[PDB]
Design an enzyme around this catalytic site. Sequence first.
Site, mmCIF file in Angstrom:
data_model
loop_
_atom_site.group_PDB
_atom_site.id
_atom_site.type_symbol
_atom_site.label_atom_id
_atom_site.label_comp_id
_atom_site.label_asym_id
_atom_site.label_seq_id
_atom_site.Cartn_x
_atom_site.Cartn_y
_atom_site.Cartn_z
ATOM 1 C CD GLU A 128 14.922 7.548 11.824
ATOM 2 O OE1 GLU A 128 15.282 8.393 12.649
ATOM 3 O OE2 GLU A 128 13.864 7.589 11.096
ATOM 4 C CG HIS A 129 17.405 8.147 17.161
ATOM 5 N ND1 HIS A 129 18.128 9.037 16.368
ATOM 6 C CD2 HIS A 129 16.773 9.029 17.934
ATOM 7 C CE1 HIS A 129 17.640 10.093 16.405
ATOM 8 N NE2 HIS A 129 16.779 10.186 17.351
ATOM 9 C CD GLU A 181 16.931 13.245 17.505
ATOM 10 O OE1 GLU A 181 16.032 12.396 17.605
ATOM 11 O OE2 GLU A 181 17.842 13.195 16.795
#
Lengths: 78, 442
Positions: free
Chosen positions: B57-58, B134
Amino acid sequence: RQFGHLTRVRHLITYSLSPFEQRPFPHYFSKGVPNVWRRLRACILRVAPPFLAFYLLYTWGTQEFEKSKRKNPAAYVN
Amino acid sequence: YAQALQSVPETQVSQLDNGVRVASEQSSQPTCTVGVWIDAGSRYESEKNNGAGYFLEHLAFKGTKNRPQNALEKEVESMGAHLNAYSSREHTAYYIKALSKDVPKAVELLADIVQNCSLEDSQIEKERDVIVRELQENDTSMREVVFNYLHATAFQGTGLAQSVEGPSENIRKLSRADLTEYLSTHYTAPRMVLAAAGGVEHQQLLELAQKHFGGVPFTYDDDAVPTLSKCRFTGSQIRHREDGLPLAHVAIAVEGPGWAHPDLVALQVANAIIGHYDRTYGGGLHSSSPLASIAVTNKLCQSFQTFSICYSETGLFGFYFVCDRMSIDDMMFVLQGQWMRLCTSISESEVLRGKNFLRNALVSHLDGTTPVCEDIGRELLTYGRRIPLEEWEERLAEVDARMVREVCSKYIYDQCPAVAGPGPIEQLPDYNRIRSGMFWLR
């Protein structure tokens, strides 16, 4: 003292399962019986002794008392 | 109202010779939002694969081979379009929101991502450390760790138990390869859906997709969709204690039925009855939701929420409260009492509202374009097609009292729950106790 003020605890994570998702008296052999023995042979040598000792003294005592009653074949050889 | 529902336009759907399902809802709005929703989550990962989908996703946005970072970003920003997305345990998605004057452009952008992410060996290594960070931020959000821990123990030993982001070890070491390996294995047309809502007209969409999604299936595997290994629920607890935190978090739950199942409506209606609280409410007079009232009268908690989170073939029906070190017990006591009450002596006066409150949600569930798209995306992916408000209506417009009971009790009564609790939780009684808090001394 009630619940909620016993001690400053931090960072312990515990995991447990419902009583219905597991077994009650599990692994009687895998781990059960061994430890029972792991114990009998851990204190026997600490508890038994003075009890055994007691016994001997009980016996000695009863036997002696029961001997001091009977007559000595020689208290009268005349 | 009923007419308002009856006059709500139908949602066009059609699959390609590819396998992709293309659906949408034409409105009028000069704006719109389109995106693809994948039949992929963390659930699909391995002990060593886990985290890929997220690492992935990142990078999904950081550029494609057809057009590197600097560009992709520049091209989207430049057209005032918004690209965002997410990934759960069984459901990932990427969506864009522009002026329906760009269905074709958006559509192309989309495809170019779900098909050609640069996966720059140089970019990856960067996001790697971005996540690890994160991740350490997701951490102090005790509101989320708690749910993770819930799933962990709830579905211990199964694919579900794994968290959507994944272990630090995995993230510290996933290979440029693994990512590709994850992409080319799950991002296939049969499992994907291209949905939209706005001024867009279906055809222009279909064609546009049918044009940029030039996938071709040879064998039968490609064309088929693999079913996952069932996940075993387990009545158990997990306690992450630390009196160092300001307050505690608790979450208890029973296994849920799963999307397909209908009762998820009656069950969805019950939760509407216990509802939720939050110190910013104004209501020691809150209609029912005694849990909330009680929570206010006796100051039982900072807040709480009822939830019916579900998956393909399973789910979690429970509740979660945030409370002070000292009111954990009563709160749990009082709440757990409501579930019983819920499925043992509910009333019509209650379910009546319950329904209404749902219907109002049910509808605001579709407030805007982005959210509507979310339904089409999901609905198809999990249900099989789309459920029109007009339908949801009936489904949940015919739930009476006896119906709630019968069900709730069917899923809650004397079941071995799964609790989780982080923070200062010394006052939370043992499992056995919360356990026998699952049957009413009727």
